Amino acid sequence: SELKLKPLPKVELPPDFVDVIRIKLQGKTVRTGDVIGISILGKEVKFKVVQAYPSPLRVEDRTKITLVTHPVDVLEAKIKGIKDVILDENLIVVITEENEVLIFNQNLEELYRGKFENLNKVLVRNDLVVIIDEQKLTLIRT
Amino acid sequence: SELKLKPLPKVELPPDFVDVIRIKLQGKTVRTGDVIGISILGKEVKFKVVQAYPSPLRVEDRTKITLVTHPVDVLEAKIKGIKDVILDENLIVVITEENEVLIFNQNLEELYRGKFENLNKVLVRNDLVVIIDEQKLTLIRT
Amino acid sequence: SELKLKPLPKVELPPDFVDVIRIKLQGKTVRTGDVIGISILGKEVKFKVVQAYPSPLRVEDRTKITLVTHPVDVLEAKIKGIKDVILDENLIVVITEENEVLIFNQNLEELYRGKFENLNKVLVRNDLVVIIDEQKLTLIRT
Amino acid sequence: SELKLKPLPKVELPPDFVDVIRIKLQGKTVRTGDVIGISILGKEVKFKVVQAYPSPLRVEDRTKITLVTHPVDVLEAKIKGIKDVILDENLIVVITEENEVLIFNQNLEELYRGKFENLNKVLVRNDLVVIIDEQKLTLIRT
Amino acid sequence: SELKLKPLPKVELPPDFVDVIRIKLQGKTVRTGDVIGISILGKEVKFKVVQAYPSPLRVEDRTKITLVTHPVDVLEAKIKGIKDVILDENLIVVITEENEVLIFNQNLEELYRGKFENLNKVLVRNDLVVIIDEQKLTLIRT
Amino acid sequence: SELKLKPLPKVELPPDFVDVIRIKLQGKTVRTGDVIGISILGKEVKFKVVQAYPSPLRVEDRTKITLVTHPVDVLEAKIKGIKDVILDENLIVVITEENEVLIFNQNLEELYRGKFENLNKVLVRNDLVVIIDEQKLTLIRT
Amino acid sequence: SELKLKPLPKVELPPDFVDVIRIKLQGKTVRTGDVIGISILGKEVKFKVVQAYPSPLRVEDRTKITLVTHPVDVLEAKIKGIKDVILDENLIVVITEENEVLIFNQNLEELYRGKFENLNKVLVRNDLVVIIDEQKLTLIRT
Amino acid sequence: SELKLKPLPKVELPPDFVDVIRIKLQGKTVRTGDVIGISILGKEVKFKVVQAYPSPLRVEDRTKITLVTHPVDVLEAKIKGIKDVILDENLIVVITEENEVLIFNQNLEELYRGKFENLNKVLVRNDLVVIIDEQKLTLIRT
Amino acid sequence: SELKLKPLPKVELPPDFVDVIRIKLQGKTVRTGDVIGISILGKEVKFKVVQAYPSPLRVEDRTKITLVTHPVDVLEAKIKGIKDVILDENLIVVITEENEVLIFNQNLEELYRGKFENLNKVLVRNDLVVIIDEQKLTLIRT
Amino acid sequence: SELKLKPLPKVELPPDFVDVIRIKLQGKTVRTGDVIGISILGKEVKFKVVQAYPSPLRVEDRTKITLVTHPVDVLEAKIKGIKDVILDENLIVVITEENEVLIFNQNLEELYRGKFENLNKVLVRNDLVVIIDEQKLTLIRT
Amino acid sequence: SELKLKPLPKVELPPDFVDVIRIKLQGKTVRTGDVIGISILGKEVKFKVVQAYPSPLRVEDRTKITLVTHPVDVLEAKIKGIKDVILDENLIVVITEENEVLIFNQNLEELYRGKFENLNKVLVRNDLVVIIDEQKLTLIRT
Amino acid sequence: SELKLKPLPKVELPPDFVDVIRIKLQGKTVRTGDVIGISILGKEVKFKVVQAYPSPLRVEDRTKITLVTHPVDVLEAKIKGIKDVILDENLIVVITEENEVLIFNQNLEELYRGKFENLNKVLVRNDLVVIIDEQKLTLIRT
């Protein structure tokens, strides 16, 4: 059991902070990507579960807990057969090998999913995504 | 059979509202872009059909219904044989196989429709669209 | 007990979704602002705990659960005696009545806290915050 | 009683089309934003009701019907007792007499509705809406 | 009878050009604001009727004709009691003393006209015009 | 004979409006690009002759009259053998196969015409047009 | 033989003024850019020679005279064998066959003239002109 | 009596060239903007009169002559009783004591001159000049 | 007594590392901006003292230590009697009670130091700082 | 052995200060970025080691010491086998031979370090770093 | 007598550098603003005479010599009775109490000097300076 | 002996100005690139020594003097085998064929010089220069 946590955006640390975390999170179920509030020294402190191994995970006394210190949010998305990726202002447009078009925002939240038998083009400009086959024009607004 | 819906007023919903929607829409025909009013907790709540796959579609028991929490709009324009598309600042220009030029705005409302026997090139910059054939030059001011 | 949850960014909804949520979240402890992953129909779905009443809260069979549908993140911060607020690009600068300067980012995460006996000025431009008393100049970079 | 209409596809019309439209609308109720399909020369053409004065209205013999060649769109939202409005980039923020805050986009689609007991100031910049009372600071991220 | 004409954008001038114009416009009816093509020296030349006195006017031998030379389009609109004018990109918003709102483009074509019993505010930003009374919010897109 | 007219920016339509137009324009001579004021229902209404076929044309009983509905100004200019067209801010530069350079504005008014025996280059930037042969440099400021 | 003229004050002209101008310029020499004063109705009016084709030219009876409205100016610089030209923000950079570099501003006023034995490349950005040969690097600051 | 001059080609001059110039201009009249050719070392060199103080002026022995390097130009327009001036992007707008409005470009070339009986306000933005009096609204499009 | 620290390499830390830091730094003197290397898990890890309140400070047992997860920098410049401060694009200009002007960059590195007997005004725009006294004008180019 | 130094406060120095600095640094080890305090005229002045060649270096008698008047800063980060680097707005992204990705800011402070087994492409835009392999897509939000 | 010199952009410093400078500049005449090359350690080094007090000055054994270290160019110009200063892009416009207008560039080189008996206004925008009295409008383009 | 001088920015010229300059520069030593103030007609006039042949040079009666008239600063730097030059805002980056990197400002003052055994890349963006070999990353801030 591994818990990789990231304080948001900071934490005042008491002595033996690991024992405290273990006691406060004892028996809880945790998944990768979760955000958990923990009462420390009388004040609420949020932690992003950067990684739970495995996920989900039940926090036990044997669970190893580490602090993540990078001032950056890491977000992942499993996508089968990525043909091309287009990047605009807080827009991420992914086209798959089977002509499926996906639209994500800055938090990597899936804003749009579409299937297109034929697929001539996909254009991106600012808030706009235009999808072109040989029968219709599809416009998607963010 | 797939439905992606979202409420027009951003009100809080009971989690089983999907059942109410299913029984209400059972056997009815739904297209992308439709707006359907449904009584919830004694008040009518309007729902926009963000996407229907396919469209049109007849709601069955095995139809997947999805709640959307983002202001995505999906617009379509049925156009036969799209050869190429140009995307500029709030202008969408479409050129077909039969040498037709169509001009849309950012809301996919048609601003112009035209046919050209000969057709060499099509240029777009800001509010201006220039169309070049073998005989004449056509200036279109948006 | 009240749980106001917001799907991120969407959820495919099964019949009797409330019973499912109640069963999956049964006996868990939840605070306002948390983000929880829930396995639904074989797929992981994240929910932002928009509000837990009270907070923290232990999910029981009597707990009323509602879905939040607004495509917007609401973030709150309790600050005693707000004298003035300055707003720049993803920067929120707050000055208190007792000459305390606070700097928040776009996620309302406290980036900086400072106490200043005397306080002549606070200036903001882009990434920069300049703090002026009668003894030193304090610059804070975001 | 006045109707301002425009065709959705920008096609060439015979000058007496208004008569057929009149026979179509004789005795019907029409509001601003309505879409009316009418057969012209054997093909269906959709017309948008750019404006109806008043709205709603029942078409009579003395109802004036006007063809519009400009791309104006008119949207309205009934809100009782509007105290103040802030207009930013594709954001419309409305504050009522009872300290209610509503946030719309450029299509006048509701992004948020919230009520606030105390209310000192409301600041808007880009995607950010800051609401300031005497106790806490509320950040709304669009 | 007086005709004030403007070449668009130029005219090659023959001897006794006044007699030429008089003969070519023989028996025609002319209104202020019209644009007329006249065959001069074997080439079509466009003239803006900058002013017809009176308007409309029937061109006779007694009609006095003068050339306007300013490289600028002058457009006029009679409005009783102008309270305020707001000016943006190719947008002219006029508010009268009796709360009438008018919206013109760069060619002074009346894009919008509205009456509002109560009237708190009128805001303009780019393509958007927002009108605020004490009952509803009106959004106008250009 | 065909007359394609566009109301500017709108027209209140009477019954049998085609007969009305035919009667009002009876015996008049019309060229493509003309703008004509016609008194309809007691108010002056401007019509752009979007196209007269042929041009010029004498309106007769056989003349087919149609209304144009596109919210766009279409301007045409016959140019023999267009080699290349350059597009900048409200500037349209056309180069012919016989080394002639033409410069138009946003209204397709011929601002400049020039012949150049030799012709190496034509560069465009903002208001400036630079023409290069093997003997001199020509600068044209708009 | 062609003259393109325009009055300096944009005042109204009698249509036959060209005749008077002709009497004034009979047998005289006219160049591009010249300013010619002519008495009309008892008052002097100055006319700029927008273009003289060719220039210089001797005015005859067969000289074509055109009235111009738009404020176009034509500037020329005789330079033998222009190899390439770079056009930047208010900077015109010319390179000749024998490796001569000349720098002009937007008024075609000569800012610099220099000769370089070897000549590899010439770079331009804003106020800076960088000249690269086989021996040294030359920086020219505008 | 002062002359500020500069050569048109930026060529190297002998330090005593001013004497030769003096011999050339003895007893002649020199104005601001004039171009004077003078033989130096057997080759003609053109000199622009950057400034003549005053202008016009008759050259004497007591005339001060200054060599200027920087490409400054001085343009003037005699206008009696200038009440106010508005300076925008390549537009100079002048309002006189008797409510006359004159519009110039960046070359001080007159684009428009107009008289208005009453005169409330004058607004300027980009290409648009709006004139507000007690009777009508006048739009001037540059 | 307060310490806000953050690691220079963004490595994962054991949660009780604060104990190690406390025992390592017990009785030592620490100032804001200091960089202190501390052995963790057999590897030296450098920690930047983001803020020490007060500074300097001697680490005790009751000293609060905070982990920071963001790239905040805190810079200070001790300057006696600061009258006013101007913040522009990457320039910070300070004016004191004793008429001293100091110029810093965005990293708070001193670019200029100057004293002025008389002192009227100080203007800042981009790279230029203009200083106006009763005698002379001083231009400072950054 | 070469030292390039500059004073932190921009004070006036006696020309022989380098001697005192030499006596201060005799036999000491100096690296790039070091800060060295030296008493001049009775007051301590800090000097930044802008560059040391080589670094580290031990000051000898034959060590060259240079006074610098330009505001250049030089930062370096030892990274074994740098495969590629992408430079955006205050973001420096480094990719190594072993497919390691490191993200730094404009102060060369480490924001992130991560290792990726497979690695097709890395895209950068504003605050966004997108990492694309054959299985998943990784978004890094700065 | 004081000489304040600044190396451009750096100087390698020999022992007893003051004696060296004194010997190399012995008996030379120096004015504020001069730039002098001095051979030091076998290499030419430029020094800007940041200040000579008095100016001019003859370097003698009594002359006090100091090094200036600020990474900034300081330029001064004595102007009697400065009423107002306007600052634009690389443009500095100064108006005196005796209605004299002076125009400087980024290097404080006097680009323009003008006297105006009456003086209503001075407006600055980019390269343009507009001067308004009660008889004429003066435009100065830089 | 030849002196090529440039007035900054102007010079009032007396009769026999060459003799005057020769007498005023009597016995002085002059280097290429120097700036010298000379009292002429009672006013200090600055001259850039554009070229001294040879350099340095002692002004004698045999010295030939010419005036340079270009309103531009010409700066030269001898660099053997220039492989590539990158140009940004007031930044000039030069890479030699033997992997030497040099960084100059707008005044061609050598801001940075570096040797790199291995050398993969050099990137430039605004104030930043990044240098990449196979062992370290070098960042240079301007």
PDB file of N, CA and C in Angstrom, chain C residues 110-117 120-121 123-126 128-142, chain I residues 4 51 53 70-82 84-89 92 94 104-108:
ATOM      1  N   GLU C 110      -4.368  29.575  -0.749  1.00  0.00           N
ATOM      2  CA  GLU C 110      -3.572  30.634  -0.136  1.00  0.00           C
ATOM      3  C   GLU C 110      -2.095  30.516  -0.495  1.00  0.00           C
ATOM      4  N   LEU C 111      -1.653  31.360  -1.422  1.00  0.00           N
ATOM      5  CA  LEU C 111      -0.261  31.378  -1.854  1.00  0.00           C
ATOM      6  C   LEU C 111       0.622  32.178  -0.898  1.00  0.00           C
ATOM      7  N   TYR C 112       0.080  33.249  -0.325  1.00  0.00           N
ATOM      8  CA  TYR C 112       0.887  34.073   0.581  1.00  0.00           C
ATOM      9  C   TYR C 112       0.103  34.720   1.715  1.00  0.00           C
ATOM     10  N   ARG C 113       0.727  34.786   2.885  1.00  0.00           N
ATOM     11  CA  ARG C 113       0.159  35.491   4.025  1.00  0.00           C
ATOM     12  C   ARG C 113       1.247  36.311   4.700  1.00  0.00           C
ATOM     13  N   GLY C 114       0.968  37.586   4.952  1.00  0.00           N
ATOM     14  CA  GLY C 114       1.962  38.454   5.556  1.00  0.00           C
ATOM     15  C   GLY C 114       1.388  39.501   6.487  1.00  0.00           C
ATOM     16  N   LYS C 115       2.105  39.777   7.572  1.00  0.00           N
ATOM     17  CA  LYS C 115       1.690  40.804   8.518  1.00  0.00           C
ATOM     18  C   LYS C 115       2.587  42.031   8.396  1.00  0.00           C
ATOM     19  N   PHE C 116       1.970  43.207   8.378  1.00  0.00           N
ATOM     20  CA  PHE C 116       2.705  44.457   8.231  1.00  0.00           C
ATOM     21  C   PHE C 116       2.167  45.504   9.201  1.00  0.00           C
ATOM     22  N   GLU C 117       2.971  45.865  10.201  1.00  0.00           N
ATOM     23  CA  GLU C 117       2.575  46.862  11.196  1.00  0.00           C
ATOM     24  C   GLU C 117       2.071  48.140  10.529  1.00  0.00           C
ATOM     25  N   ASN C 120       1.569  51.315   3.729  1.00  0.00           N
ATOM     26  CA  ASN C 120       1.256  52.440   2.866  1.00  0.00           C
ATOM     27  C   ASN C 120       0.522  51.999   1.604  1.00  0.00           C
ATOM     28  N   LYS C 121       1.016  50.950   0.949  1.00  0.00           N
ATOM     29  CA  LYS C 121       0.450  50.565  -0.344  1.00  0.00           C
ATOM     30  C   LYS C 121       0.571  49.085  -0.683  1.00  0.00           C
ATOM     31  N   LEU C 123       0.408  47.116  -4.510  1.00  0.00           N
ATOM     32  CA  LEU C 123       0.209  47.240  -5.951  1.00  0.00           C
ATOM     33  C   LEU C 123       0.257  45.880  -6.639  1.00  0.00           C
ATOM     34  N   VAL C 124      -0.582  45.700  -7.654  1.00  0.00           N
ATOM     35  CA  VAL C 124      -0.640  44.435  -8.379  1.00  0.00           C
ATOM     36  C   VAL C 124      -0.533  44.665  -9.885  1.00  0.00           C
ATOM     37  N   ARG C 125       0.340  43.903 -10.537  1.00  0.00           N
ATOM     38  CA  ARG C 125       0.469  43.946 -11.988  1.00  0.00           C
ATOM     39  C   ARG C 125       0.947  42.600 -12.517  1.00  0.00           C
ATOM     40  N   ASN C 126       0.050  41.891 -13.200  1.00  0.00           N
ATOM     41  CA  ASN C 126       0.338  40.569 -13.754  1.00  0.00           C
ATOM     42  C   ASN C 126       0.673  39.532 -12.682  1.00  0.00           C
ATOM     43  N   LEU C 128       2.987  40.010 -10.387  1.00  0.00           N
ATOM     44  CA  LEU C 128       3.699  40.700  -9.317  1.00  0.00           C
ATOM     45  C   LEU C 128       2.792  41.360  -8.278  1.00  0.00           C
ATOM     46  N   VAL C 129       3.189  41.251  -7.013  1.00  0.00           N
ATOM     47  CA  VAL C 129       2.561  42.000  -5.931  1.00  0.00           C
ATOM     48  C   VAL C 129       3.632  42.764  -5.146  1.00  0.00           C
ATOM     49  N   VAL C 130       3.469  44.079  -5.040  1.00  0.00           N
ATOM     50  CA  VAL C 130       4.422  44.918  -4.323  1.00  0.00           C
ATOM     51  C   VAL C 130       3.789  45.483  -3.055  1.00  0.00           C
ATOM     52  N   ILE C 131       4.463  45.301  -1.924  1.00  0.00           N
ATOM     53  CA  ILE C 131       3.940  45.756  -0.642  1.00  0.00           C
ATOM     54  C   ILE C 131       4.844  46.819  -0.034  1.00  0.00           C
ATOM     55  N   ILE C 132       4.247  47.947   0.340  1.00  0.00           N
ATOM     56  CA  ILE C 132       5.000  49.114   0.786  1.00  0.00           C
ATOM     57  C   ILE C 132       4.602  49.614   2.168  1.00  0.00           C
ATOM     58  N   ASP C 133       5.557  49.540   3.092  1.00  0.00           N
ATOM     59  CA  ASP C 133       5.476  50.223   4.379  1.00  0.00           C
ATOM     60  C   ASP C 133       6.525  51.337   4.420  1.00  0.00           C
ATOM     61  N   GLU C 134       6.899  51.769   5.619  1.00  0.00           N
ATOM     62  CA  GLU C 134       7.848  52.870   5.760  1.00  0.00           C
ATOM     63  C   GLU C 134       9.244  52.406   6.176  1.00  0.00           C
ATOM     64  N   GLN C 135       9.614  51.189   5.788  1.00  0.00           N
ATOM     65  CA  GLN C 135      10.924  50.652   6.144  1.00  0.00           C
ATOM     66  C   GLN C 135      11.524  49.764   5.056  1.00  0.00           C
ATOM     67  N   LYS C 136      10.673  49.064   4.316  1.00  0.00           N
ATOM     68  CA  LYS C 136      11.151  48.164   3.272  1.00  0.00           C
ATOM     69  C   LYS C 136      10.141  48.001   2.145  1.00  0.00           C
ATOM     70  N   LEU C 137      10.612  47.470   1.023  1.00  0.00           N
ATOM     71  CA  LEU C 137       9.739  47.127  -0.087  1.00  0.00           C
ATOM     72  C   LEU C 137       9.677  45.611  -0.202  1.00  0.00           C
ATOM     73  N   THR C 138       8.467  45.065  -0.211  1.00  0.00           N
ATOM     74  CA  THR C 138       8.296  43.625  -0.333  1.00  0.00           C
ATOM     75  C   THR C 138       7.673  43.243  -1.672  1.00  0.00           C
ATOM     76  N   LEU C 139       8.406  42.427  -2.421  1.00  0.00           N
ATOM     77  CA  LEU C 139       7.940  41.914  -3.702  1.00  0.00           C
ATOM     78  C   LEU C 139       7.630  40.421  -3.616  1.00  0.00           C
ATOM     79  N   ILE C 140       6.469  40.037  -4.134  1.00  0.00           N
ATOM     80  CA  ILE C 140       6.041  38.646  -4.135  1.00  0.00           C
ATOM     81  C   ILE C 140       5.739  38.165  -5.553  1.00  0.00           C
ATOM     82  N   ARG C 141       6.446  37.125  -5.988  1.00  0.00           N
ATOM     83  CA  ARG C 141       6.278  36.586  -7.335  1.00  0.00           C
ATOM     84  C   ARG C 141       5.406  35.336  -7.351  1.00  0.00           C
ATOM     85  N   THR C 142       4.486  35.274  -8.307  1.00  0.00           N
ATOM     86  CA  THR C 142       3.579  34.139  -8.431  1.00  0.00           C
ATOM     87  C   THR C 142       4.040  33.273  -9.606  1.00  0.00           C
TER      88      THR C 142
ATOM     89  N   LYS I   4       8.731  29.104   6.670  1.00  0.00           N
ATOM     90  CA  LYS I   4       8.103  28.578   5.471  1.00  0.00           C
ATOM     91  C   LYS I   4       9.205  28.172   4.499  1.00  0.00           C
ATOM     92  N   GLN I  51      10.084  31.982   3.602  1.00  0.00           N
ATOM     93  CA  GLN I  51       9.878  33.109   4.510  1.00  0.00           C
ATOM     94  C   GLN I  51      10.215  32.772   5.957  1.00  0.00           C
ATOM     95  N   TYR I  53       9.618  34.474   9.723  1.00  0.00           N
ATOM     96  CA  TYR I  53       8.988  35.551  10.479  1.00  0.00           C
ATOM     97  C   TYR I  53       9.217  35.375  11.978  1.00  0.00           C
ATOM     98  N   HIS I  70       4.540  25.564  -3.937  1.00  0.00           N
ATOM     99  CA  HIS I  70       4.353  26.511  -5.033  1.00  0.00           C
ATOM    100  C   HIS I  70       5.592  27.398  -5.171  1.00  0.00           C
ATOM    101  N   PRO I  71       5.879  27.876  -6.397  1.00  0.00           N
ATOM    102  CA  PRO I  71       7.151  28.561  -6.647  1.00  0.00           C
ATOM    103  C   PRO I  71       7.152  30.022  -6.211  1.00  0.00           C
ATOM    104  N   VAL I  72       6.621  30.301  -5.026  1.00  0.00           N
ATOM    105  CA  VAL I  72       6.615  31.656  -4.490  1.00  0.00           C
ATOM    106  C   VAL I  72       8.012  32.120  -4.086  1.00  0.00           C
ATOM    107  N   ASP I  73       8.346  33.347  -4.470  1.00  0.00           N
ATOM    108  CA  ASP I  73       9.577  33.975  -4.030  1.00  0.00           C
ATOM    109  C   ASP I  73       9.233  35.237  -3.252  1.00  0.00           C
ATOM    110  N   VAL I  74       9.949  35.474  -2.160  1.00  0.00           N
ATOM    111  CA  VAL I  74       9.720  36.660  -1.345  1.00  0.00           C
ATOM    112  C   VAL I  74      10.993  37.489  -1.309  1.00  0.00           C
ATOM    113  N   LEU I  75      10.920  38.687  -1.875  1.00  0.00           N
ATOM    114  CA  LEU I  75      12.079  39.561  -1.973  1.00  0.00           C
ATOM    115  C   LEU I  75      11.870  40.836  -1.167  1.00  0.00           C
ATOM    116  N   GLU I  76      12.955  41.353  -0.602  1.00  0.00           N
ATOM    117  CA  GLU I  76      12.883  42.547   0.232  1.00  0.00           C
ATOM    118  C   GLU I  76      13.992  43.541  -0.094  1.00  0.00           C
ATOM    119  N   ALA I  77      13.668  44.824   0.018  1.00  0.00           N
ATOM    120  CA  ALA I  77      14.661  45.878  -0.124  1.00  0.00           C
ATOM    121  C   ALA I  77      14.455  46.901   0.986  1.00  0.00           C
ATOM    122  N   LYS I  78      15.411  46.976   1.907  1.00  0.00           N
ATOM    123  CA  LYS I  78      15.324  47.925   3.010  1.00  0.00           C
ATOM    124  C   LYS I  78      15.588  49.335   2.495  1.00  0.00           C
ATOM    125  N   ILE I  79      14.553  50.168   2.513  1.00  0.00           N
ATOM    126  CA  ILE I  79      14.656  51.542   2.038  1.00  0.00           C
ATOM    127  C   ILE I  79      13.958  52.495   3.003  1.00  0.00           C
ATOM    128  N   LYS I  80      14.715  53.452   3.529  1.00  0.00           N
ATOM    129  CA  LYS I  80      14.202  54.373   4.538  1.00  0.00           C
ATOM    130  C   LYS I  80      13.245  55.416   3.962  1.00  0.00           C
ATOM    131  N   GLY I  81      12.039  55.467   4.521  1.00  0.00           N
ATOM    132  CA  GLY I  81      11.063  56.484   4.171  1.00  0.00           C
ATOM    133  C   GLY I  81      10.601  56.457   2.726  1.00  0.00           C
ATOM    134  N   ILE I  82       9.866  55.414   2.356  1.00  0.00           N
ATOM    135  CA  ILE I  82       9.336  55.307   1.002  1.00  0.00           C
ATOM    136  C   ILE I  82       8.074  56.149   0.829  1.00  0.00           C
ATOM    137  N   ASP I  84       6.540  56.940  -2.319  1.00  0.00           N
ATOM    138  CA  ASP I  84       5.662  56.404  -3.353  1.00  0.00           C
ATOM    139  C   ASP I  84       6.388  55.385  -4.231  1.00  0.00           C
ATOM    140  N   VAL I  85       5.617  54.498  -4.853  1.00  0.00           N
ATOM    141  CA  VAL I  85       6.164  53.444  -5.699  1.00  0.00           C
ATOM    142  C   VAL I  85       5.362  53.317  -6.991  1.00  0.00           C
ATOM    143  N   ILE I  86       6.067  53.205  -8.113  1.00  0.00           N
ATOM    144  CA  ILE I  86       5.421  53.025  -9.408  1.00  0.00           C
ATOM    145  C   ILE I  86       5.753  51.657  -9.998  1.00  0.00           C
ATOM    146  N   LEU I  87       4.715  50.929 -10.396  1.00  0.00           N
ATOM    147  CA  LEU I  87       4.870  49.580 -10.925  1.00  0.00           C
ATOM    148  C   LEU I  87       4.456  49.531 -12.394  1.00  0.00           C
ATOM    149  N   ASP I  88       5.421  49.267 -13.269  1.00  0.00           N
ATOM    150  CA  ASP I  88       5.164  49.190 -14.701  1.00  0.00           C
ATOM    151  C   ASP I  88       5.611  47.830 -15.246  1.00  0.00           C
ATOM    152  N   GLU I  89       5.758  47.735 -16.564  1.00  0.00           N
ATOM    153  CA  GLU I  89       6.149  46.487 -17.211  1.00  0.00           C
ATOM    154  C   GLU I  89       7.604  46.128 -16.901  1.00  0.00           C
ATOM    155  N   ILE I  92      10.286  48.478 -11.473  1.00  0.00           N
ATOM    156  CA  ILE I  92       9.782  48.970 -10.199  1.00  0.00           C
ATOM    157  C   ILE I  92      10.548  50.226  -9.797  1.00  0.00           C
ATOM    158  N   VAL I  94      11.020  53.430  -7.184  1.00  0.00           N
ATOM    159  CA  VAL I  94      10.770  53.853  -5.811  1.00  0.00           C
ATOM    160  C   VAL I  94      11.257  55.280  -5.586  1.00  0.00           C
ATOM    161  N   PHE I 104      14.468  49.268  -9.881  1.00  0.00           N
ATOM    162  CA  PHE I 104      14.643  47.819  -9.789  1.00  0.00           C
ATOM    163  C   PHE I 104      13.991  47.105 -10.971  1.00  0.00           C
ATOM    164  N   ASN I 105      14.442  45.884 -11.251  1.00  0.00           N
ATOM    165  CA  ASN I 105      13.773  45.036 -12.235  1.00  0.00           C
ATOM    166  C   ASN I 105      12.778  44.083 -11.571  1.00  0.00           C
ATOM    167  N   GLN I 106      12.252  43.131 -12.337  1.00  0.00           N
ATOM    168  CA  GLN I 106      11.230  42.225 -11.819  1.00  0.00           C
ATOM    169  C   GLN I 106      11.795  41.195 -10.839  1.00  0.00           C
ATOM    170  N   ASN I 107      13.120  41.103 -10.767  1.00  0.00           N
ATOM    171  CA  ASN I 107      13.773  40.221  -9.806  1.00  0.00           C
ATOM    172  C   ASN I 107      14.265  40.990  -8.589  1.00  0.00           C
ATOM    173  N   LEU I 108      13.848  42.249  -8.494  1.00  0.00           N
ATOM    174  CA  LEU I 108      14.275  43.160  -7.432  1.00  0.00           C
ATOM    175  C   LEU I 108      15.791  43.350  -7.381  1.00  0.00           C
TER     176      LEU I 108
END
